[PDB]
């Protein structure tokens, strides 16, 4: 998480997926202490599995979005280990290189 | 000092998952706008992960853990 | 926390040869606000 | 039809295909400003302790009116006053800082 | 090409083994000073703008001179690795 | 310079104004200059009438009748340069006349509602959009008609196709399946077509007798006579086939649309879609679809002849009608006006979708304006098109020819999704119909072959999107001075003869004539000849038509000549070709590069800034010059006055040259004295060798201007300020900044100097709790401010030539939110030719300058004249382009005759003509040297010795007669300049037209040691005074793997940019004098563990024996 044009930030989507789960898990805790009407506790547990499935792997159940403007799947722990660059492929695929140059020949 | 000839992937017991971690992420608190500094026990804690201050390497290598109240499935093994 | 400045990142993007200063400009312009 | 004259904005994610809807992610073009981030801890450590020094060496009814107005929650001076005229608070406020700034 | 490469390829069972020998010799020929050498009496590599390669321009080239004479020994498990490093530093100064 | 032109083919009619495809189309699309009273409506006014009867009738309360009267534009907001300084669009406001009726008394008409701005076209044919000039390409697609395809899957019969577009129409297919059911495929449905004919009123007793008499196959029609005994009951019967659960009683519902109103229409009543089925089948078509509104029961104008012509084809010969897809009478070109109107109507029905919902929430009568009209749907729909469509793109204005070629492109990759990058094979090939209509040369190399191709010189687009080439009629055997532009299909009806056909005024001469019927090459007699070409120029594009001896050039290296003239950079000492084609004064006319007198008159004033002339009619006009304007890709486009005060002029005469114009002629390069011979490995493969005399004479110098820009944005931290007192700057670093912080005009700026000084407050915020008190304690505004100026990047700049301040109190500028001011600085460079730059002739001879010899040591003639350029003859035989060889010979004669030549493209210079001009030349190259007192050189005779041994001179003659024999063959005795010894054989030299391409070596060279590194990926990037790295790709990894470069490869992947600990140790140890250690552990390996570890995967690392190994360094 970074601080961009003085007052603007940039966020890895994992961080909002991790916050979502801290949300759901903490509300589940407080809903057990403050009385457990079942169908309520069950909604919250459903929400908890849904937010674990979220930060682990999106697009397997319909994707969770950031706001009503960038309706584009948040990048999950599964996205980072596959796909266009990922972790496995990008090392094989080739990186930029410090001591290098071009010119015409 | 010793060489790395083999790598193995296994399933990690939650007792393991607690071992690799240094402390639990408590609150859904990233950082506040007033002070660009880690909030109370949040995703970017320094006690848990390491100092953002000078290197930045111990911080990209120390993990935290979340303590679920009800278990949830690793969707990989479901879908 | 951690700091950054967009003006130098944009010039780097323009040098990197991704698209023309037109597309990068539209990008920084959507970056600015809505 | 106009957009006129006279701490709130919404985050853009880190990974977004820039350019001709290509393979780049937006974190890829961010270089950095510095690693250590000095004058933070060593400054506030001086900053805070040398505050309370002069802050207590004049009257607490003087120095704390602004210590906590400009520093604790909000701001104001239409109600800065714990019960005096809006004119004497401006009086004692300014006069407080002045003997606080330089002592004759 | 490079002086007497054909002779160096013949010295080794493996093309690539020459490389490692050259490299590892170059490393010590820099690390434990430069006086590690076996050939430094008379005519050993030279340069221009003066004649000045008798101290320290190109260590890898040196190693290829040195290996071009029977003065050096190369092989799989010659001496225990650890007393190798202890005896090199211990015998030669410059640190 | 006298000009002699070669060959006489009386090219009866001139070139069409080459920009008309853009100008005249966008004129048709916007009937702006003519009153709304005027009858014709196509384009903008038709886009209204299509949507504009707006009928919400009765779903609870109705009476919405809002309908069209007038529209007008009138006034653009700002001038054009204005629109370019300030990043503005060059628009006009579109606001139309409106009246909305009620179910009750009255009708509240409001006059104007400026529902959106609409951009305008300049007189040269380009758009200004975001402050940048911009060009709308054309498009090609299948023209909307009735087509008949041979059955792809089933070998032996055919399938029909009725194709409407805009895609708002339904595609339909008429595959006559096996067993005889006349099937019919709509939207993947299929069923006997008879179900539809009976919805049209066709009873089955007339269907067989009067349509299907000649074919017995009509018995495949009447099979289901059980369903086709009932007329309107078959409409409900057909309604069954769509199944969302419709109400079967709604009668005209679905057949309203593929009846009249919105689905298969073509632009207008007349010839918009009617020509495309009237010619292929039936006789007429009607209103623009298969409609009845006045009676309720439906008439078809189409289905009967469509199936009737699927009979006439499946059996016998009416003609043998079949339809070819790629024929240019059955594919259609979409100009700029249509494209905008297409998008304008989609933007007009996004408004109609809104006026409907504002009819429900409306109050009773208070509606007239913006309660129905907002610009949002139209304004955004036009803005999307010009600014981010696939067919809008920066004006390729490297030189005049570059932009003219660009406005006259034709693309196949339409933004609607016409053709995509995957398919190529038959799509890209040249078809017979491209003859006279599309250049077989202009297409670019690589991926976009055949897809993007420019239209022919004489070709033009008629009232519908068809390309139409001219031909001239011949009456029996008598050729006329009367020309007919013909459709591609209409072309095929006739015998067309070839333009190189002998004449006697009006008669054919040879009984044995070359002529084309439809596509085939046919040899014919004078009587059969029905038409003839106008000129050989009508076959190729404008660029391909500037190559002088194209006739002698392979088609393959001919497109390389054509495409490179685009890349010609304007040279300060610019020059017209020594041997032209003829179009080089017509190109600088039609592109508005230059400035020509409007009438006859006299010149009154000539600055370098402006020209002033006094015409006959009494006018005294002031023409201001474009002084040093930057182009879109860096080249310098200025005008230069070429007349004097008191000089009379004629109408059309030239007053000022454009950027690449020499005295009215297209000047893309320069005429150098070239010797074509090898040299000491310096002109290897396609390299070039240069005489330093060029740089002295400053011929290959070209000005270039870059543009640097900064904003003084407004920030949380406090406002940024364009000022001179930057904190941590030496006084020497500020010597050239004015008191405001802007670099002064006329100062040489080197990479790293300051252009405009900017200072911003220290980041991380305004810390209210404590600092807010300090602000009152300590002299307020005594905060801290850092340096965030603008500096010449790596690469370079030049000398500052112009600045632009757009300051607050904004006097006509649209500064972005939070933008306080903006400041620009223009820097310029006289860029001489340098080793590495790229050069090429018109014939397609790529080449980089590889060596700049001093004049002393390079080949020269007997008189001490050296040659200027040394081309390797090994570039000629593979690349079949002998045209450059003729340009050299003819250029050799023109150099001692002091004259230039025009060899028309295929009516060119023949060898005898060239020879006798060379014979004329040599009596000057050498006739004079006899008189000055000098005979033949002992070296000249040593070469004539070997010459006759090589068979180039006939022995026994005198040296003079031999040298003339040897001259006529283009070759001369040449002496190596560094030994003075003769070249041992003769060598051809002469004048060749060579030019300097956009690929110089300033954009090109980069060198990176160390520098910035990205954040999520740690590989590096360029910035303050550092370049980026080069990408070491996967194939480059296979390379090092194919050697033993294990350490070299790991460096590429570890210490170069990716592994932080590794590279830091790597550079610190280089400053030490140490060797670089590899890891440690690698960054990729530790990250892939913990990043896998983020998912609950236990990944361990193991020893040789299975044992735990901690890879995180304690």
Sort out which chain F residues have CB atoms less than 8 A from E26's CB and list them.
1075
Q: After which residues is chain A broken (C to N over 2.5 A)?
A: none
F502: nearest Cα among F529, F539, F540: F529
Q: How far is F1069 from chain E (nearest CA, A)?
A: 12
Q: Which residues contact F603 (CB under 8 A, 6 or more apart)?
A: F611, F612, F613, F614, F643, F644, F645, F646, F647, F648, F649, F655
Q: Which residues contact B41 (CB under 8 A, 6 or more apart)?
A: B25, B26, B27, B29, B48
List the domain range (segments joined by +) for residue D77: 36-104
In chain C, which residue's Cα lies nearest the Cα of F1029?
C16
The domain locations on chain E are 1-95
- Rounded to whole angstroms, the Cα distance separating E75 from F407 reads 72
- Rounded to whole angstroms, the Cα distance separating F78 from F88 reads 8
CB-CB contact of F326 with F426 (8 Å): yes
DSSP-assigned beta bridge partners for residue F1006: A102
Q: Is D74 annotated as a binding residue?
A: no
Dihedral through CA F143, CA F146, CA F151, CA F156, nearest 10?
A: -130
Instruction: Report CA Rg, chain B.
Output: 16
Provide the terminal-to-terminal Cα distance of chain D, rounded to the nearest Å.
Answer: 59
- Rounded to whole angstroms, the Cα distance separating F1062 from F1078 reads 7
What tokens appear for F772 in the block?
Answer: 């807010």
Give the H/E segment covering residue B8.
strand B6-11
Do D and E share at least 3 CB pairs under 8 Å? no
List the domain range (segments joined by +) for residue F246: 141-334
Residue with tokens 């002469």: F990
Instruction: Report CA Rg, chain E.
Output: 14
B51: nearest Cα among B35, B37, B40: B37
Q: What is the resolution of this structure in A?
A: 4.0
Homologous superfamily, domain E1-95: RNA polymerase subunit, RPB6/omega (3.90.940.10)
DSSP-assigned beta bridge partners for residue F1012: none
Backbone angles phi, psi at F600, to 5 degrees: -70, 150
What tokens appear for F618 in the block?
Answer: 């009494």
Pick from F768, F777, F1014: CB nearest D31: F1014
CB-CB contact of F1012 with F894 (8 Å): no
Give the H/E segment covering residue F1069.
helix F1060-1072
Half-sphere exposure of F478 (CA within 13 A, CB side): 1
HEC profile for F502-570? CEECCEECCCCEEEECCCCEEEECCCCCCEECCCHHHHCCCCHHHCCCHHHECHHHHHHHHHHHHCECC
- Tallying the residues shown for chain E, one arrives at 95
F75: nearest Cα among F89, F96, F91: F91
- Rounded to whole angstroms, the Cα distance separating F1072 from F1076 reads 10
HEC profile for F991-1032? EEEEEEECCCCCCCCEEECCCCECCCCCCECCCCCCCCCEEC
- Helices F883-897 and F911-925 cross at an angle (nearest 10°) of 40
Instruction: Report CA Rg, chain C.
Output: 11
- Rounded to whole angstroms, the Cα distance separating D62 from F13 reads 98
Half-sphere exposure of D11 (CA within 13 A, CB side): 18
**D33–C3: do the CB atoms touch at under 8 Å?**
yes
- Rounded to whole angstroms, the Cα distance separating F361 from F497 reads 69
- Measured from the Cβ of residue A18, the count of other Cβ atoms closer than 10 Å reads 23
SS3 F695: helix
HEC profile for F334-400? ECHHHHHHHHHHHHHHHHHHHHHHHHHCCCCCCCCCCCCCCCHHHHHHHHHHHHHCCCEEECCCCCH
CB-CB contact of F969 with F914 (8 Å): no
Q: Where are the beta strands (DSSP E) in F163-238?
A: 172-173, 185-186
CB-CB contact of F845 with F547 (8 Å): no
Backbone angles phi, psi at D29, to 5 degrees: -110, 40
A52-74 burial, b if ≥16 CB within 10 A, otherwise e?
bbbbbbbeeeeebebeeeeeebb
List of chains touching B (3+ CB pairs within 8 A): A, C, D, F
- Burial class for F521, CB neighbours closer than 10 Å (0-12, 13-18, 19+): exposed
SS3 F461: strand
Q: How far is E94 from chain F (nearest CA, A)?
A: 13
Q: How far is F29 from chain D (nearest CA, A)?
A: 30
CB-CB contact of F17 with F405 (8 Å): no
CB-CB contact of F70 with F34 (8 Å): no
**A75–D14: do the CB atoms touch at under 8 Å?**
yes
- Rounded to whole angstroms, the Cα distance separating F534 from F252 reads 54
Q: Tell me if the bond preceding F58 is cis, omega within 30° of 0.
A: no
SS3 F65: strand
Sheet of A9-11: strand order equals: A2-3, A9-11, D12-13
Number of H helices, E strands in chain D: 3, 1
HEC profile for chain C? CCECCHHHHHHHHHHCCCCCHHHHHHHHHHHHCC
Put simply, whether A94 touches F (Cβ < 8 Å) is: yes
What tokens appear for F820 in the block?
Answer: 């306080």
Put simply, whether A42 touches B (Cβ < 8 Å) is: no
What tokens appear for F468 in the block?
Answer: 């139409």
Q: What does F409-447 look like in DSSP terms, one character per residue?
A: -EES--TTTSS-SS--HHHHS--GGGTTTB-SS---SGG
Give the H/E segment covering residue F70.
strand F64-72
Put simply, whether A30 touches F (Cβ < 8 Å) is: no
Give the H/E segment covering residue A96.
strand A96-97
- Rounded to whole angstroms, the Cα distance separating F935 from F927 reads 10
HEC profile for F716-742? CCEECEECCCCCCCCHHHHCCECCCCE
**F764–A2: do the CB atoms touch at under 8 Å?**
no
- Taking CA atoms, F850 is separated from F338, F666, F718, F840, F877, in Å, by 49, 28, 54, 13, 21
Pick from A19, A21, A56: CB nearest B74: A56
SS3 F761: strand
Q: Which of C6, C11, C17, C19 to probe the D interface (max D CBs under 10 A)?
A: C19
- Burial class for F338, CB neighbours closer than 10 Å (0-12, 13-18, 19+): buried
Do E and C share at least 3 CB pairs under 8 Å? no
Dihedral through CA F332, CA F336, CA F338, CA F340, nearest 10?
A: 140
Residue with tokens 């932009």: F403
SS3 B18: helix
- Rounded to whole angstroms, the Cα distance separating F655 from F370 reads 51
- Burial class for F650, CB neighbours closer than 10 Å (0-12, 13-18, 19+): exposed
Query: Chain-centre distance of CA F156, in angstroms?
Result: 43
Sort out which chain D residues have CB atoms less than 8 A from B55's CB and list them.
35
- Rounded to whole angstroms, the Cα distance separating F917 from F587 reads 28
CB-CB contact of F347 with F51 (8 Å): no
What tokens appear for C29 in the block?
Answer: 């312009």
Sort out which chain A residues have CB atoms less than 8 A from C6's CB and list them.
4-5
Instruction: Report CA Rg, chain D.
Output: 24
- Rounded to whole angstroms, the Cα distance separating E85 from F399 reads 69
Provide the terminal-to-terminal Cα distance of chain B, rounded to the nearest Å.
Answer: 41
- Rounded to whole angstroms, the Cα distance separating F253 from F239 reads 9
**D36–B52: do the CB atoms touch at under 8 Å?**
no
**A5–C5: do the CB atoms touch at under 8 Å?**
yes
- Burial class for F704, CB neighbours closer than 10 Å (0-12, 13-18, 19+): buried
DSSP-assigned beta bridge partners for residue F719: F714
- Rounded to whole angstroms, the Cα distance separating B61 from F775 reads 42
Backbone angles phi, psi at F804, to 5 degrees: -140, 115
What tokens appear for F369 in the block?
Answer: 């304006």
Query: What DSSP designation does F406 have?
Result: H
Query: Chain-centre distance of CA B73, in angstroms?
Result: 19
Q: Is D23 annotated as a binding residue?
A: yes
């Amino acid at each position: 998480m970074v601080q961009v044009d003085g007052g603007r930030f940039a966020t890895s989507d994992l961080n909002d997926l991790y916050r979502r789960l801290i949300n759901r898990n903490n509300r589940l805790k407080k809903l057990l202490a403050q009385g457990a009407p079942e169908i309520i506790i069950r909604n919250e547990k459903r929400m908890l599995q849904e937010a674990v499935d979220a930060l682990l792997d999106n697009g397997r159940r319909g994707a969770p979005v950031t706001n009503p403007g960038s309706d584009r799947p948040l990048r999950s722990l599964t996205d980072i280990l596959s796909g266009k660059q990922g972790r496995f492929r990008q090392n094989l695929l080739g990186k930029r290189v410090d001591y290098s140059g071009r010119s015409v020949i | 000092k010793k060489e790395v000839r083999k790598v193995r992937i296994a399933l990690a017991s939650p007792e393991k998952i607690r071992s690799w971690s240094y402390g639990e992420v408590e609150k859904p608190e990233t950082i506040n706008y007033r002070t660009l500094k880690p909030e109370r026990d949040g995703l970017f804690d320094e006690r848990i992960f390491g100092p953002i201050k000078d290197k930045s390497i111990v911080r990209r290598y120390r993990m935290g853990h979340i303590e679920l109240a009800t278990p949830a499935a690793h969707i990989w093994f479901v879908k | 926390m951690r700091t950054v400045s967009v003006e130098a990142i944009v010039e780097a993007l323009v040098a990197e040869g991704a698209l023309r200063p037109e597309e990068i400009a539209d990008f920084v312009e959507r970056i600015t606000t809505l | 039809g106009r957009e006129p004259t006279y701490i709130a904005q919404e985050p853009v994610s880190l990974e977004t295909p820039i350019g001709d809807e290509k393979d780049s992610f937006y974190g890829d073009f961010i270089p950095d400003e510095h690693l250590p981030s000095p004058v933070d801890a060593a400054t506030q450590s001086l900053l805070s302790e040398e505050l309370e020094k002069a802050l207590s060496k004049l009257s607490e009814r003087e120095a704390m009116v602004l210590k906590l107005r400009k520093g604790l929650i909000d701001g104001e001076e239409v109600g800065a006053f714990f019960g005096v005229t809006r004119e004497r608070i401006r009086q004692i406020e300014n006069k407080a800082l002045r003997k606080l700034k330089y002592h004759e | 090409a490079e002086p007497g490469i054909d002779k160096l390829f013949g010295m080794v069972d493996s093309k690539y083994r020459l490389t490692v020998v050259v490299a590892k010799r170059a490393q010590q020929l820099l690390r434990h000073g430069f006086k590690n050498t076996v050939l430094e009496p008379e005519e050993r590599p030279k340069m221009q703008t003066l004649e000045g390669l008798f101290d320290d321009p190109n260590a890898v080239t040196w190693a290829m001179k040195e290996l071009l004479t029977g003065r050096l020994v190369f092989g799989e498990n010659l001496v225990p690795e650890d007393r190798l490093q202890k005896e090199m530093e211990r015998l030669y100064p410059v640190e | 310079m006298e000009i002699k032109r070669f060959g006489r083919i009386r090219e009866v009619i001139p070139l069409p104004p080459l920009t008309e495809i853009q100008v005249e189309s966008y004129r048709r699309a916007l009937q702006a200059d003519v009153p709304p009273e005027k009858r014709e409506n196509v384009g903008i006014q038709a886009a209204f009438r299509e949507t504009f009867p707006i009928e919400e009738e009765d779903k609870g309360k109705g009476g919405l009748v809002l309908d069209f009267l007038e529209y007008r534009l009138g006034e653009p907001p700002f001038p054009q340069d204005e629109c370019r300084e300030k990043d503005l669009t060059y628009q006009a406001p579109l606001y139309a006349r409106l009246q909305l009726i009620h179910k009750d008394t009255g009708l509240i008409k409001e006059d104007e509602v400026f529902l959106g701005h609409i951009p305008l076209m300049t007189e040269d044919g380009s758009f200004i959009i975001n402050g940048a000039d911009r060009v709308i390409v054309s498009q090609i697609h299948r023209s909307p008609g009735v087509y008949f395809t041979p059955d792809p899957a089933r070998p032996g019969r055919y399938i029909a196709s009725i194709i409407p577009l805009p895609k708002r129409g339904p595609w339909i297919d008429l595959e006559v399946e096996p067993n005889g059911v006349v099937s019919m495929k709509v939207n993947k449905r299929k069923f006997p077509l008879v179900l539809l004919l009976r919805v049209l009123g066709y009873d089955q007793e007339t269907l067989a007798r009067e349509l299907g008499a000649y074919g017995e196959l009509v018995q495949g029609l009447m099979d289901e006579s059980v369903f086709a005994m009932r007329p309107e009951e078959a409409l409900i019967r057909l309604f069954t086939l769509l199944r969302p659960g419709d109400p079967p009683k709604r009668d005209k519902a679905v057949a309203y649309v593929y009846g009249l109103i919105a689905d298969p229409r073509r632009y207008d009543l007349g010839e918009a879609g009617r020509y495309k089925a009237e010619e292929k089948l039936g006789i007429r078509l009607s209103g623009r679809t298969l409609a009845r509104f006045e009676d309720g029961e439906f008439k078809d104008e189409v289905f009967l002849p469509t199936l009737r012509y699927l009979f006439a084809l499946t059996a016998g010969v009416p003609g043998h009608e079949v339809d070819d897809i790629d024929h240019l009478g059955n594919r259609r070109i979409r100009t700029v006006g249509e494209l905008m109107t297409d998008q304008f109507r989609v933007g007009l029905a996004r408004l109609a979708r809104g006026v409907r919902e504002r009819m429900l929430m409306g109050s009773e009568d208070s509606l007239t304006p913006a309660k129905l009209v907002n610009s949002r749907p139209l304004e955004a729909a036009i803005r999307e098109f010009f600014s981010r469509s696939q067919l809008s793109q920066f004006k390729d204005e490297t030189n005049p020819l570059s932009s003219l070629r660009h406005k006259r492109r034709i693309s196949a990759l339409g933004p609607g999704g016409l053709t995509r990058e995957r398919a190529g094979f038959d799509v890209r090939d040249v078809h017979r119909t491209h003859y006279g209509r599309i250049c077989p040369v202009e297409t670019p190399e690589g991926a976009n072959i055949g897809l993007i191709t420019s239209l022919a010189a004489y070709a033009r687009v008629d009232e519908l999107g068809f390309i139409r080439t001219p031909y001239r009629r011949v009456v029996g055997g008598v050729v006329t001075d009367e020309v007919v532009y013909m459709t591609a299909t209409e072309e095929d009806r006739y015998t067309i003869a070839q333009a190189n056909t002998p004449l006697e005024g009006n008669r054919i001469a040879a009984e044995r004539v070359v002529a084309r019927r439809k596509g085939e090459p046919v040899i014919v007699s004078p009587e059969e000849v029905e038409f003839m070409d106008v000129s050989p120029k009508q076959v190729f594009s404008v660029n391909t038509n500037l190559i002088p001896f194209l006739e002698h050039d392979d088609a393959n290296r001919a497109l390389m000549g054509s495409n490179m003239q685009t890349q010609a950079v304007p040279l300060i000492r610019a020059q017209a070709p020594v041997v032209m084609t003829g179009l080089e004064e017509r190109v600088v006319r039609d592109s508005l590069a230059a400035l020509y007198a409007e009438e006859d008159g006299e010149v009154a004033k000539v600055d370098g800034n402006r020209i002033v002339v006094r015409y006959e009619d009494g006018r005294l006009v002031e023409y201001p010059l474009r002084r040093f304007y930057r182009s879109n890709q860096g080249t310098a486009l200025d005008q230069r006055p070429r007349v004097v005060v008191g000089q009379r002029v004629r109408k059309g005469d030239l007053l000022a040259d454009g950027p690449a114009s020499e005295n009215g002629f297209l000047a893309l390069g320069q005429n150098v004295l070239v010797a074509i011979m090898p040299f000491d490995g310096y002109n290897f493969e396609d390299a070039i060798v240069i005489s330093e005399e060029l740089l002295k004479r400053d011929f290959y110098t070209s000005i270039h201007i870059e543009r640097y820009e900064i904003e003084a944005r407004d920030t949380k931290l406090g406002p940024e300020r364009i000022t001179r007192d930057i904190p941590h700057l030496s006084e020497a670093a500020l010597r050239d900044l004015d008191e405001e912080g802007v670099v002064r005009i006329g100062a040489e700026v080197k990479p790293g100097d300051i252009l405009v000084g900017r200072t911003s407050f220290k980041g991380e915020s305004e810390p209210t709790p404590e600092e807010r008190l300090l602000r009152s304690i300590f002299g307020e505004k005594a905060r801290d401010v850092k340096d965030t100026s603008l500096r010449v990047p790596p690469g370079e700049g030049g000398i500052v030539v112009r600045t632009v301040r757009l300051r607050r109190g904004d006097p006509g500028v649209e500064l972005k939110p939070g933008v306080r001011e903006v400041v620009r600085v223009y820097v310029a460079q006289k860029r001489k030719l340098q080793v590495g730059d790229k050069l090429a002739n018109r014939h397609g001879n790529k080449g980089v300058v590889a060596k700049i010899l001093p004049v002393e040591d390079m080949p020269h003639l007997p008189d001490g004249t050296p040659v200027d350029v040394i081309l390797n003859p090994l570039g000629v035989p593979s690349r079949m382009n002998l045209g450059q060889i003729l340009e050299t010979h003819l250029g050799l004669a023109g150099y001692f005759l002091g004259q230039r030549y025009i060899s028309p493209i295929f009516d060119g210079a023949k060898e005898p003509e060239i020879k006798e001009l060379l014979a004329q030349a040599f009596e000057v190259y050498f006739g004079k040297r006899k008189g000055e007192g000098f005979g033949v050189d002992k070296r000249e005779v040593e070469v004539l010795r070997r010459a006759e041994k090589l068979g180039l001179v006939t022995p026994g003659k005198t040296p003079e007669e031999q040298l003339k024999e040897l001259f006529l063959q283009g070759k001369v005795v040449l002496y190596d300049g560094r030994t003075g010894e003769p070249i041992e054989g003769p060598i051809v030299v002469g004048q060749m037209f060579i030019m300097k391409l956009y690929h110089m070596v300033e954009d090109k060279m980069h060198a990176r040691s160390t520098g910035p590194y990205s954040l999520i990926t740690q590989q590096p990037l360029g910035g303050k005074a550092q370049f980026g790295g080069q990408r070491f790709g996967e194939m480059e990894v296979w390379a090092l793997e194919a050697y033993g470069a294990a350490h070299t490869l790991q460096e590429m992947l570890t210490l170069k940019s990716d592994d932080i600990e590794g590279r830091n140790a790597a550079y610190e140890a280089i400053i030490k004098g140490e060797d670089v250690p590899e890891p440690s552990v690698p960054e990729s390996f530790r990250v892939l563990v913990k990043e896998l570890q983020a998912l609950a995967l236990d990944v361990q690392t193991l020893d040789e024996k299975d044992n735990p190994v901690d890879i995180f360094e304690g």
